PDB file of C-alpha atoms and ligand atoms in Angstrom:
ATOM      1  CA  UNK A   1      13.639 -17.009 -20.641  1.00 16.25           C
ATOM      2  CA  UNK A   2      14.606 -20.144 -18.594  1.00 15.96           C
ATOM      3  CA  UNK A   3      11.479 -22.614 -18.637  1.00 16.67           C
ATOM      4  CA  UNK A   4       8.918 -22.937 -15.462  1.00 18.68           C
ATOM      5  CA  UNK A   5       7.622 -26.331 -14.462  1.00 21.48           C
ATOM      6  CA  UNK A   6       4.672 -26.751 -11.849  1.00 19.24           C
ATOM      7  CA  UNK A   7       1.152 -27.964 -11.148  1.00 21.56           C
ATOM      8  CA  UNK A   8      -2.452 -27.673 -11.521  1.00 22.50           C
ATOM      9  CA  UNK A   9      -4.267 -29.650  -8.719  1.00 20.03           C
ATOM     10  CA  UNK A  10      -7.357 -30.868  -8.497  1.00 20.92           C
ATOM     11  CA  UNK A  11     -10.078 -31.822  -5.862  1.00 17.13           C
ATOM     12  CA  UNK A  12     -12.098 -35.395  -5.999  1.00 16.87           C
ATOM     13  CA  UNK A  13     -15.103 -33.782  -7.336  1.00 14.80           C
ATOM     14  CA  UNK A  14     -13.026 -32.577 -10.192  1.00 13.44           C
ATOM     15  CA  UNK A  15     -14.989 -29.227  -9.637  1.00 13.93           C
ATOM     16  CA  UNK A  16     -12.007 -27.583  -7.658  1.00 15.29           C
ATOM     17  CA  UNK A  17      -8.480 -25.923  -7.937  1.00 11.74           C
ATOM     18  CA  UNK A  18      -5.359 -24.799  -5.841  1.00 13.79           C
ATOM     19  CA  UNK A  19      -4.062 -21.816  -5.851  1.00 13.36           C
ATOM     20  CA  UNK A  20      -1.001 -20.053  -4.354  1.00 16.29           C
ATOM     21  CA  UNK A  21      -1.308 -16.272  -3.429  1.00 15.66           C
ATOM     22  CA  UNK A  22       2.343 -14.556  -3.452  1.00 16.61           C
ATOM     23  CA  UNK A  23       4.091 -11.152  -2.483  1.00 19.24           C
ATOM     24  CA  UNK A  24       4.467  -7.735  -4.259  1.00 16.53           C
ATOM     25  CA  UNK A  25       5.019  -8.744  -7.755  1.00 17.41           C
ATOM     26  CA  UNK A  26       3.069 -11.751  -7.473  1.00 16.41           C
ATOM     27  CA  UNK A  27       0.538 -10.480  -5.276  1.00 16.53           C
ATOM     28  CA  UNK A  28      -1.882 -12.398  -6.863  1.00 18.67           C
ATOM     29  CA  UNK A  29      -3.276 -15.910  -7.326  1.00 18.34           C
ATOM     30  CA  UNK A  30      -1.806 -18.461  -9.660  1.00 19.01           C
ATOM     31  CA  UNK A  31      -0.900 -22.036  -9.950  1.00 18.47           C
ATOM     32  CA  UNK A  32       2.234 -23.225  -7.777  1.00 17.79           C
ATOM     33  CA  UNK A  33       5.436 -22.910 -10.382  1.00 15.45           C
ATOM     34  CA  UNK A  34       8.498 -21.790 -10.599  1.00 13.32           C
ATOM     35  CA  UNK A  35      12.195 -21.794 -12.441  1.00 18.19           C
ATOM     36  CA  UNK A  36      14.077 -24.824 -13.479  1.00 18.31           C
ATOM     37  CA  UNK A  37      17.857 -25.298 -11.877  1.00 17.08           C
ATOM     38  CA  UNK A  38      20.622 -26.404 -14.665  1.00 15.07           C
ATOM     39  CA  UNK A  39      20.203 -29.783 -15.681  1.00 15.34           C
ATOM     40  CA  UNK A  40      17.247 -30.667 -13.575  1.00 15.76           C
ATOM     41  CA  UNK A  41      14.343 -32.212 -15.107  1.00 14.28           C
ATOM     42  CA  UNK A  42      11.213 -31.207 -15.579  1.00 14.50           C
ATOM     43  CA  UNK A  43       9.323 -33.678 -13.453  1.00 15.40           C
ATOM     44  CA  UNK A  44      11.678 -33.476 -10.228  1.00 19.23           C
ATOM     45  CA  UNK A  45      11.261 -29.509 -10.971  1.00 17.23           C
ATOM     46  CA  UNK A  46       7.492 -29.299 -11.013  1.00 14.74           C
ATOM     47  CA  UNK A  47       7.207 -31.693  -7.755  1.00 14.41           C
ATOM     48  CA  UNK A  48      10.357 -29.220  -6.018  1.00 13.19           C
ATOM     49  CA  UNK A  49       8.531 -26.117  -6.556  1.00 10.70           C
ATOM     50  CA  UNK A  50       4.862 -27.198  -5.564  1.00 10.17           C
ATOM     51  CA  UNK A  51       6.444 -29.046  -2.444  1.00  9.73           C
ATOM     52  CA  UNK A  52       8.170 -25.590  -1.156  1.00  7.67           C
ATOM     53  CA  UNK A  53       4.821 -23.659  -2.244  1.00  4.49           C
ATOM     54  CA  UNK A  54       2.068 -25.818  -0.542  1.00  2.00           C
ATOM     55  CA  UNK A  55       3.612 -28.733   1.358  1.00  2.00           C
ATOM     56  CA  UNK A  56       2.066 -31.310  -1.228  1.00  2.00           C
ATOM     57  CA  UNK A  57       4.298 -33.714  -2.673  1.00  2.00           C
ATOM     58  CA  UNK A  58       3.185 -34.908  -6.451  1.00  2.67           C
ATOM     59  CA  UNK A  59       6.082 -37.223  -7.303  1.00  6.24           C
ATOM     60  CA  UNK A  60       3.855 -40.233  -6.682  1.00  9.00           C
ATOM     61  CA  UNK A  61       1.286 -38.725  -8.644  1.00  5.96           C
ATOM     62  CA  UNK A  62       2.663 -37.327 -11.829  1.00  4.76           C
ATOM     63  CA  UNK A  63       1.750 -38.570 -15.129  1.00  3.58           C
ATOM     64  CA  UNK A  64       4.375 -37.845 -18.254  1.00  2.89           C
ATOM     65  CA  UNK A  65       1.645 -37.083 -20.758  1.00  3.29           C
ATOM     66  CA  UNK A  66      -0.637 -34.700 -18.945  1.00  5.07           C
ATOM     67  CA  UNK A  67       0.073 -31.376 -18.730  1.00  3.63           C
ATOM     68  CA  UNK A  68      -1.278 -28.132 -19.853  1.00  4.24           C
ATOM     69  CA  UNK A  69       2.054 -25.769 -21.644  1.00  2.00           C
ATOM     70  CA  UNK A  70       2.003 -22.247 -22.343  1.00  2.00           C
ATOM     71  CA  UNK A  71       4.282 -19.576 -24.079  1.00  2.00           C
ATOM     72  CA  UNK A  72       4.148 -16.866 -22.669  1.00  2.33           C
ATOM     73  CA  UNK A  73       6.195 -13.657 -24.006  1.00  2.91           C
ATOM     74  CA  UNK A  74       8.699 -15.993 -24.428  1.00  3.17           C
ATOM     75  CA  UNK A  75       9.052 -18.154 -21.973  1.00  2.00           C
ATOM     76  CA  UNK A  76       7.892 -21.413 -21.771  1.00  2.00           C
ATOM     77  CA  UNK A  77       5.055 -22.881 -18.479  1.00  2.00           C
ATOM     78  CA  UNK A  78       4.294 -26.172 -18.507  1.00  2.00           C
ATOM     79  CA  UNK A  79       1.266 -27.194 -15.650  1.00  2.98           C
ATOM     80  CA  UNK A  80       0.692 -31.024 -14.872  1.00  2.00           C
ATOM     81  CA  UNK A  81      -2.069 -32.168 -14.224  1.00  2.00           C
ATOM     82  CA  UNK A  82      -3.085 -33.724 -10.836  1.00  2.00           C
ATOM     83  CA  UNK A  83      -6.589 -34.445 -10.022  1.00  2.00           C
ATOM     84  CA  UNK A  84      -8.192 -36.493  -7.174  1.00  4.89           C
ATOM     85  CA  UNK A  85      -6.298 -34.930  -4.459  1.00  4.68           C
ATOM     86  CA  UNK A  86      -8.809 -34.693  -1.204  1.00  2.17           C
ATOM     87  CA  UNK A  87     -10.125 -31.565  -0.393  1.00  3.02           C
ATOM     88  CA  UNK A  88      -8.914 -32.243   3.434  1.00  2.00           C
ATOM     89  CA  UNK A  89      -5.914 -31.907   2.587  1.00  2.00           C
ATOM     90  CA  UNK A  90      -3.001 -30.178   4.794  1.00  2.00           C
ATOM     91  CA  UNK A  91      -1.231 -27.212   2.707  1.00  2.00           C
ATOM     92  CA  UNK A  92       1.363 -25.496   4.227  1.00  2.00           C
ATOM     93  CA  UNK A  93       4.052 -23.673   2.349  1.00  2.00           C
ATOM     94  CA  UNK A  94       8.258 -24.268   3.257  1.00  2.00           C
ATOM     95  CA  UNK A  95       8.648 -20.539   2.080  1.00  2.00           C
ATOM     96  CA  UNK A  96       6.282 -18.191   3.909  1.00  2.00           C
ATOM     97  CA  UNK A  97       8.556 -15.225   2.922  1.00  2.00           C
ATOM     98  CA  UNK A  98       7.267 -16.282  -0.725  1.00  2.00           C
ATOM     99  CA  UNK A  99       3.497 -17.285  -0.136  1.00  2.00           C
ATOM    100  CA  UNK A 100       0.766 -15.520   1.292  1.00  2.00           C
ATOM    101  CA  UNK A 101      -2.357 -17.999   1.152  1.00  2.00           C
ATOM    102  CA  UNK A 102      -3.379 -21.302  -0.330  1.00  2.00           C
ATOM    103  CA  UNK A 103      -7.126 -21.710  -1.299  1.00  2.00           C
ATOM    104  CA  UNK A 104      -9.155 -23.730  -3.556  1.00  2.00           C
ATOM    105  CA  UNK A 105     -11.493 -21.918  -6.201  1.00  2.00           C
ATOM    106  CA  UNK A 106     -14.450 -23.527  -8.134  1.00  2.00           C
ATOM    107  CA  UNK A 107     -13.087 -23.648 -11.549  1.00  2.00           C
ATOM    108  CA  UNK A 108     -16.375 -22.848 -12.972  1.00  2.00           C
ATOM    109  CA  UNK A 109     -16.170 -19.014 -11.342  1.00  2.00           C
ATOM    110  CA  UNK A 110     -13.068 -18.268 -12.518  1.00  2.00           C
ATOM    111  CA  UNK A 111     -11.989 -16.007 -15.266  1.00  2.00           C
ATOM    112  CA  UNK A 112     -10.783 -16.887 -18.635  1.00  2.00           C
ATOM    113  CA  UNK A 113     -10.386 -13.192 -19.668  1.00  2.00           C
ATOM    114  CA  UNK A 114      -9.535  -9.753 -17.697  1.00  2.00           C
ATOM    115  CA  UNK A 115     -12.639  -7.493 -18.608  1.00  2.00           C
ATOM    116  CA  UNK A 116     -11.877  -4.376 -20.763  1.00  2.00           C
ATOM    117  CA  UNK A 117     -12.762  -0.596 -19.874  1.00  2.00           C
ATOM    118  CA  UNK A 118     -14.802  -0.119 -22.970  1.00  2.00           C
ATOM    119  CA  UNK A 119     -17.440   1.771 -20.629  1.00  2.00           C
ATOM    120  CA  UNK A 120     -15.092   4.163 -20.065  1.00  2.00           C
ATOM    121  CA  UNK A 121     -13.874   4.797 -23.633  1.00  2.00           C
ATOM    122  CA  UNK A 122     -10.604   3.724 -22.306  1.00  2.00           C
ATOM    123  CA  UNK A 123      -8.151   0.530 -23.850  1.00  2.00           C
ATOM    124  CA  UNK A 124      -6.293  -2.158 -22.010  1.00  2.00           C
ATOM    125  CA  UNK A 125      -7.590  -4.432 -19.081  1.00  2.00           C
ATOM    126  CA  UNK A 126      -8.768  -3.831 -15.584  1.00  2.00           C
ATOM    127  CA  UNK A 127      -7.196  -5.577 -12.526  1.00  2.00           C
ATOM    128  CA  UNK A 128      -7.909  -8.576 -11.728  1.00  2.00           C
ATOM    129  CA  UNK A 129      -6.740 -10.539  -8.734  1.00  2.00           C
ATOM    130  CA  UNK A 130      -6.582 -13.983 -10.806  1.00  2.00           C
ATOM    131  CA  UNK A 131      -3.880 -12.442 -13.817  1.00  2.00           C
ATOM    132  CA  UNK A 132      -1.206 -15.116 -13.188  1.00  2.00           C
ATOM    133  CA  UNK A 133      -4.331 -17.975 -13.401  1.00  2.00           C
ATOM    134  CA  UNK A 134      -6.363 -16.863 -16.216  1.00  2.00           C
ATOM    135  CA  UNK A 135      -4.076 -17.975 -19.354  1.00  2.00           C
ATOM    136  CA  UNK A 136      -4.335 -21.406 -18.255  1.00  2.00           C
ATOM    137  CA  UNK A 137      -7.989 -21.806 -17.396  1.00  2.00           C
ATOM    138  CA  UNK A 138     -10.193 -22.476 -21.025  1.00  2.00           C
ATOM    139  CA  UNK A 139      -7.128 -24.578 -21.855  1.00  2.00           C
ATOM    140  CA  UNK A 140      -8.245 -26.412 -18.459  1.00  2.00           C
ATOM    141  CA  UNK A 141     -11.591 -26.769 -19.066  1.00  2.00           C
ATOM    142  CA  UNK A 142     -10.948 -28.083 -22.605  1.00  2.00           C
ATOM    143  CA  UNK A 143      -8.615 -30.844 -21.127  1.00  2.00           C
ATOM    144  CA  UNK A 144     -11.171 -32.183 -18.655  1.00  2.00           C
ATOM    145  CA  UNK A 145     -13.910 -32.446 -21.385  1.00  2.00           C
ATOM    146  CA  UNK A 146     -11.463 -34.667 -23.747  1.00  2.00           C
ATOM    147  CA  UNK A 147     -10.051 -36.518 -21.044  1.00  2.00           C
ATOM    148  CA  UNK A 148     -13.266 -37.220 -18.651  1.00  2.00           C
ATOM    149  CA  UNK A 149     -16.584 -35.682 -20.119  1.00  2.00           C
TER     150      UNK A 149
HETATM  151  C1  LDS B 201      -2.350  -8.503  -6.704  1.00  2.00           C
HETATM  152  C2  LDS B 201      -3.093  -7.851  -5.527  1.00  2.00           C
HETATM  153  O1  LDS B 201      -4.341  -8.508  -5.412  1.00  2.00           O
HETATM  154  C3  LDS B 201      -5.354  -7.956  -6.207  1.00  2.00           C
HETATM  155  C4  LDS B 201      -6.523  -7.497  -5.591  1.00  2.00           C
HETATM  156  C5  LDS B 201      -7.517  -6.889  -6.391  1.00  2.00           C
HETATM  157  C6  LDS B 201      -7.295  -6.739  -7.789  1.00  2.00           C
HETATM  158  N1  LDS B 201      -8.111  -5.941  -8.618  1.00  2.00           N
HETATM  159  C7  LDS B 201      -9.419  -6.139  -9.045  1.00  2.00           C
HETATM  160  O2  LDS B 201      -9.928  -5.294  -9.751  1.00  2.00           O
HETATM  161  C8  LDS B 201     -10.290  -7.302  -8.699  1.00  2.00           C
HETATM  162  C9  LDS B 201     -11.491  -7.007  -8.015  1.00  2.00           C
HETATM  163  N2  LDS B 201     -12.441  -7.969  -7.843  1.00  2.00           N
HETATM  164  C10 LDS B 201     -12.188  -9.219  -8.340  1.00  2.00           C
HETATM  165  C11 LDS B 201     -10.967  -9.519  -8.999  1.00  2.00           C
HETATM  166  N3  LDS B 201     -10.008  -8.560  -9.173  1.00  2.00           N
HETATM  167  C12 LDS B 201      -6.141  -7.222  -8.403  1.00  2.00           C
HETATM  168  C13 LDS B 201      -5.169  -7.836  -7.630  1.00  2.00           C
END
C-alpha cells in the first residue's frame, strides 16, 4: 500500500480538532491526508495534502518528532501533530470536487470505538459518521497527556 502523510490540527485551547468531510467513499469525517508522490518526502507530503484539503499551510509549523502513525490493513498513516492554530482561522479547500466541509470537533465527544449491535443479537459495527477519525483518537489523547498534562 503506498504510505499516507497528513495532519492532526489543533485549536489554542488544545480542546479542539479539524476535520475534513469528503465524497462517496469518503463520505465521512477524518483528518486531512492523503498519498505520497515517488520520491517526495514525507514532510513536503503532509503540508501538500492538508494545503489542497483546507487552505492551511503547516510547513512553518511542523515538528520532525511529533506525529501520531498507524498501520492500517497494511498500509502505513502517519498524522503530525499541529496544535495552537487559532480557531479564527480561514479554511478553504483547493479541491472542492474532493471536500465537502471543514469543521472543528471537541476532542473530548468524539469516538474512540464504533458501537456494536449486541442489542440486536447481531455482530460487526454500526455506522458511524467519524470511521476514518476514530483509529487515531485514544492514541491522541494519550499524546497530549505525555506531552502537556
Ligand atoms: C459517510 C456518510 O456520513 C455518515 C452519516 C451517518 C452515519 N451513520 C451513523 O449511524 C451515525 C449516526 N449518528 C452519529 C454518528 N454516526 C455514518 C456516516
Amino acid at each position: 500500500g503506498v504510505p499516507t502523510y497528513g495532519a492532526i490540527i489543533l485549536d489554542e485551547t488544545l480542546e479542539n480538532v479539524l476535520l475534513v468531510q469528503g465524497y462517496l467513499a469518503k463520505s465521512g469525517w477524518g483528518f486531512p491526508k492523503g498519498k505520497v508522490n515517488k520520491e517526495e518526502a514525507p514532510h513536503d507530503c503532509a503540508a501538500r495534502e492538508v494545503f489542497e484539503e483546507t487552505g492551511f499551510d503547516i510547513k512553518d509549523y511542523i515538528c520532525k518528532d511529533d506525529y501520531i502513525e498507524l498501520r492500517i490493513n497494511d498500509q502505513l498513516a502517519r498524522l503530525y501533530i499541529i496544535p495552537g492554530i487559532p480557531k479564527d482561522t480561514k479554511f478553504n479547500p483547493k479541491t472542492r470536487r474532493e471536500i465537502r466541509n471543514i469543521e472543528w470537533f471537541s476532542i473530548e465527544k468524539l469516538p474512540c470505538h464504533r458501537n456494536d449491535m449486541t442489542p440486536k443479537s447481531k455482530l460487526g459495527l454500526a455506522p458511524n459518521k467519524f470511521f476514518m477519525a476514530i483509529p487515531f483518537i485514544r492514541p491522541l489523547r494519550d499524546w497530549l497527556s505525555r506531552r502537556f498534562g
